[PDB]
Design a binder for this molecule. Structure first.
Ligand SMILES: Nc1nonc1C(=O)N1CCN(Cc2ccccn2)CC1
Ligand SMILES: Nc1nonc1C(=O)N1CCN(Cc2ccccn2)CC1
Lengths: 238, 238
């Protein structure tokens, strides 16, 4: 349907088996809802030792990805993708990913994700080959592979067939009715669908307010949400 | 040395091969700097079909992880860990992970990471078994495995032997000297180490200011940084 094709450039393509062979994303791939295709810069090297890193001009302790194998891998992925593929570099210097950002990226039918290693890629490749730079969070990882897999997983949820409001989630409960002395809220046992809905929404508003108050600032709360939030705050203040 | 032990509770333990078998984290594991040990709730089931999900009280479209197999897996991981292990649940309702948070978690010698699937785990298990809840970002994934692997990768960088200031990174350049008409900044070719240092720091300040101005607010800039930032801003304003 709205199937998605994601090309990946990575020195460790076998890492992506974690999403292509298991769980929800694994099923998406099996059912041809998601296609993930990997190119390894190591395969585009020509020297005997298949060199994929290179020294930075200006010195320093680190290395960068070697330009020629990486550039050639990217070009190969672009040729396979055809027209309309957006090329993404994952790094801490990119636009911070959130769910709105995920929904934006998910509108793309084709993505190419470039996974950096070492101290990253040549700035001129970012200028000449990368459409958008994104970060999955303000922390530093050993490479772009986990970020790429995280992005793939998040956007995959928006492909129709893959799955079976700005607020944090409400608490959920399952069997048994009592667990180390802790009981399930009686409302959830009541069978009263409307009370249960309002209880869940109220809990969500309360948890967002207590844990992530700044998320509430970004919202235009509905009349019902304003009411339930006021109630939750009143109860919190006893 | 400051080796780290990380217990993992996951319905898809084979996903963690992406970090235990490859790259920097793979080497950490091989060199016994990092130990990652997985328990699968499916192995703690007793029914013929090894059931690991259960219906939420109060209804709704989703499922939760079944309490008994998950609880038993967690208890088993805690027994293996001995004393001092901090138990973490990964979810969008948790404390937002950043590099400071990574450095905090990395001070722990033992971690147990609980990977949720479905609509997550019973709220009472969070109360009774989880020490801390963390989020790797404000977006929704299909399960806690990629978040757990991301956390493991980030904290692993702080284990001594694993690897070979609040600002975004400077641009980096490697061979060739000219790439699609784009040249390497002459300062990086100059061999003047102090000019190169100041240029890199200035670029870092400029990029942070242009891309992530709010990160600058959280910093107490050094005298040198204040100067170079003013210069970068002056040049930006031509
Ligand atoms: N945070 C993140 N959100 O996406 N990716 C990351 C992330 O930490 N990494 C690890 C280091 N990389 C290689 C690198 C190093 C320095 C500059 C540019 N590239 C990028 C991928
Ligand atoms: N963002 C994140 N940072 O850490 N983990 C995530 C994340 O998206 N997920 C996927 C859904 N999970 C299962 C679940 C669903 C609802 C409530 C609680 N648990 C948690 C793991």
């Amino acid at each position: 349907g709205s199937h998605m094709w994601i090309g990946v450039i990575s020195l460790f393509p076998e890492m992506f088996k974690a999403i292509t062979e298991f769980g929800v994303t694994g099923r998406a791939v099996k059912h041809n809802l998601l296609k993930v295709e990997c190119w390894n810069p190591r395969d585009f090297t020509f020297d005997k030792h298949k060199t994929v890193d290179d020294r930075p001009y200006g010195g320093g302790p680190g290395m960068l990805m070697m330009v020629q194998p990486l550039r050639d891998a990217i070009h190969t992925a672009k040729a396979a993708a055809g027209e309309g593929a957006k090329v993404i570099y994952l790094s801490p210097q990119g636009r911070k990913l959130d769910q709105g950002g995920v929904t934006e990226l998910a509108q793309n039918q084709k993505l190419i994700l470039v996974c950096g290693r070492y101290e990253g890629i040549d700035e001129r490749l970012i200028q000449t080959e990368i459409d958008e730079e994104w970060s999955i969070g303000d922390y530093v990882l050993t490479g772009g592979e986990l970020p790429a897999m995280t992005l793939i997983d998040a956007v995959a949820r928006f492909i129709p067939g893959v799955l079976g409001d700005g607020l944090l989630d409400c608490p959920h409960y399952t069997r048994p009715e009592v667990l180390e002395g802790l009981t399930v809220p009686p409302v959830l046992m009541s069978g009263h669908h409307e009370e249960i809905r309002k209880w869940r929404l109220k809990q969500s508003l309360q948890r967002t307010w207590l844990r992530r108050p700044e998320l509430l600032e970004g919202l235009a709360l509905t009349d019902e949400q304003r009411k339930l939030l006021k109630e939750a705050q009143a109860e919190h203040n006893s």
